[PDB]
Amino acid sequence: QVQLKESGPGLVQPSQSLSITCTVSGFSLTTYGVHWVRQSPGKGLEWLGVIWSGGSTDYNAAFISRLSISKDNSKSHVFFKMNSLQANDTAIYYCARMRITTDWFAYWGQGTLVTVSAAKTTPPSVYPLAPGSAAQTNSMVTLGCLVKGYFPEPVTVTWNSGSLSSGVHTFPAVLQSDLYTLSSSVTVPSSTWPSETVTCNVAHPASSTKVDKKIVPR
Amino acid sequence: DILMNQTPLSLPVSLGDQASISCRSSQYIVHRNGNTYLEWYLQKPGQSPKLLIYKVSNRFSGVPDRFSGSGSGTDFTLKISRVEAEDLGVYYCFQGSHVPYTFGGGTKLELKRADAAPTVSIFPPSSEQLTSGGASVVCFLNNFYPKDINVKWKIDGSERQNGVLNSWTDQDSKDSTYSMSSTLTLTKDEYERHNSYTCEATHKTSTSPIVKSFNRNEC
Numbered sequence: 200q201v202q203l204k205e206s207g208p209g210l211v212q213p214s215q216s217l218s219i220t221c222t223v224s225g226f227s228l229t230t231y232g233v234h235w236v237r238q239s240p241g242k243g244l245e246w247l248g249v250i251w252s253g254g255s256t257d258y259n260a261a262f263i264s265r266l267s268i269s270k271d272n273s274k275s276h277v278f279f280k281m282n283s284l285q286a287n288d289t290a291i292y293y294c295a296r297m298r299i300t301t302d303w304f305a306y307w308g309q310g311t312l313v314t315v316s317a318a319k320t321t322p323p324s325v326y327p328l329a330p331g332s333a334a335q336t337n338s339m340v341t342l343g344c345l346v347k348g349y350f351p352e353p354v355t356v357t358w359n360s361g362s363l364s365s366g367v368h369t370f371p372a373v374l375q376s377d378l379y380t381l382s383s384s385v386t387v388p389s390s391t392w393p394s395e396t397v398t399c400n401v402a403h404p405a406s407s408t409k410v411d412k413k414i415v416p417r
Numbered sequence: 418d419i420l421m422n423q424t425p426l427s428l429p430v431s432l433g434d435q436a437s438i439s440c441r442s443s444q445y446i447v448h449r450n451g452n453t454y455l456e457w458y459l460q461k462p463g464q465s466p467k468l469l470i471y472k473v474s475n476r477f478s479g480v481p482d483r484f485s486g487s488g489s490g491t492d493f494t495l496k497i498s499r500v501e502a503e504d505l506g507v508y509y510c511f512q513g514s515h516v517p518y519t520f521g522g523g524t525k526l527e528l529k530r531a532d533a534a535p536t537v538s539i540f541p542p543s544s545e546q547l548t549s550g551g552a553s554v555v556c557f558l559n560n561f562y563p564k565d566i567n568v569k570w571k572i573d574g575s576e577r578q579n580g581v582l583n584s585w586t587d588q589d590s591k592d593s594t595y596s597m598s599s600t601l602t603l604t605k606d607e608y609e610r611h612n613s614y615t616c617e618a619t620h621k622t623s624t625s626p627i628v629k630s631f632n633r634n635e636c
């Protein structure tokens with residue numbers, strides 16, 4: 200089958216270069232061109248460039264000064280290379296077959312998430328979110344866990360190990376200065392808290408951190 | 418560059434419904450070597466975009482016949498005759514006629530469900546956080562529909578924007594609702610200059626906002 204395997208860094212320093220290698224199988228680079236596309240929440244999908252089968256290139260005008268695509272036909276390798284990355288170059292990068300003519304010989308690479316940052320590995324601070332002293336008791340009670348100031352992604356959050364699955368929402372991280380923050384909420388029957396324990400389990404494999412935080416009334 | 422305008426931005430549908438997505442280019446999509454390169458992609462959460470339709474109307478292998486592409490010039494349409502679960506995701510048009518090649522902004526095909534009000538909960542800063550000289554006030558707005566929502570923070574009656582960070586969840590695969598967190602970060606010192614902290618959610622399920630607050634001096 201057609202396959203596009205990508206290999207490259209998950210993380211790049213500000214002002215350093217990004218190199219991704221797309222390794223192709225199922226079709227020949229002498230016959231087909233390969234495009235490069237990136238994706239960010241802000242910009243949607245963004246076409247960056249193409250290396251045609253005859254070996255000429257074309258580039259998005261906004262990247263011409265810092266982007267080069269090249270290849271090795273015999274090794275089925277396409278090389279994407281971009282200089283001077285900054286925060287707004289954070290995106291998922293894809294090699295892909297596009298402008299297609301055929302039923303069949305058309306795929307996209309899996310995609311390489313690239314974050315551009317100088318932040319060091321940093322464990323999260325974990326804070327419990329218990330309802331305020333003067334909160335109303337209502338038949339369900341919602342608790343939470345604030346996971347603050349970590350880098351890089353990801354963290355995982357569970358509640359009572361795997362015990363509490365239902366009524367959980369763990370929200371996507373957002374950058375706060377150079378560091379990530381997220382929170383997780385869990386909703387249980389009022390009768391059963393604080394009488395039964397509720398503990399959020401936070402893991403940050405990058406820093407080898409595991410923290411349990413028991414949610415106790417104020 | 419050629420702007421590709423996709424509409425609608427989101428398209429709520431029930432299963433079984435027809436669906437129609439439009440794509441408009443800012444200039445005529447001309448042939449190259451006799452081929453008019455207008456493509457539609459479907460992206461599902463966490464996966465790469467997959468090709469549905471190539472060359473305007475041509476159905477890529479493995480794509481079922483409930484999908485159809487049509488149009489010419491500056492006006493193109495993707496139709497789904499009878500929507501199934503697996504069709505949900507974000508659809509994109511793409512033109513390969515004029516360099517630089519360009520994608521539409523995306524149309525998110527989503528599940529329709531009964532409207533639901535957000536369950537709002539506010540949380541003062543923890544004492545552990547206060548010890549570190551930081552103060553985060555967290556608001557959860559959970560299990561609402563539709564997805565359009567507005568959150569506003571007030572501090573002793575005054576609106577407050579700086580130091581606010583929001584995060585939205587994807588549509589839930591089971592109950593089809595959305596959820597959101599809103600977090601107001603302050604210094605301890607600033608947190609203690611004020612008494613009343615309010616989290617206001619405006620949502621279509623009411624003309625009045627949902628208000629949740631606490632007074633620092635009663636905690």
Ligand SMILES: *[C@@H]1O[C@H](CO[C@@H]2O[C@@H](C)[C@@H](O)[C@@H](O)[C@@H]2O)[C@@H](O[C@@H]2O[C@H](CO)[C@@H](O[C@@H]3O[C@H](CO[C@H]4O[C@H](CO)[C@@H](O)[C@H](O)[C@@H]4O)[C@@H](O)[C@H](O)[C@@H]3O)[C@H](O)[C@H]2NC(C)=O)[C@H](O)[C@H]1NC(C)=O
Nearest residue numbers: 213214241242245261264265282283284285286287288289
């Ligand atoms: C994505 O972001 C890049 C990089 O932008 C960075 O973040 C912004 C907020 C600024 O802090 C930049 O300094 C960062 O690089 C954007 O590129 C820049 O766009 C801005 C215009 O909005 C340009 O601003 C100008 O900077 C001039 C300085 O030029 C020279 O001087 C210094 C020497 O110290 C050096 O840093 C620079 O490389 C040059 O040697 C200045 O004369 C002028 O007044 C103005 O401030 C800036 O030149 C660009 N910066 C970089 C690093 O390329 C992209 O535009 C942005 N893209 C999108 C889509 O938003």
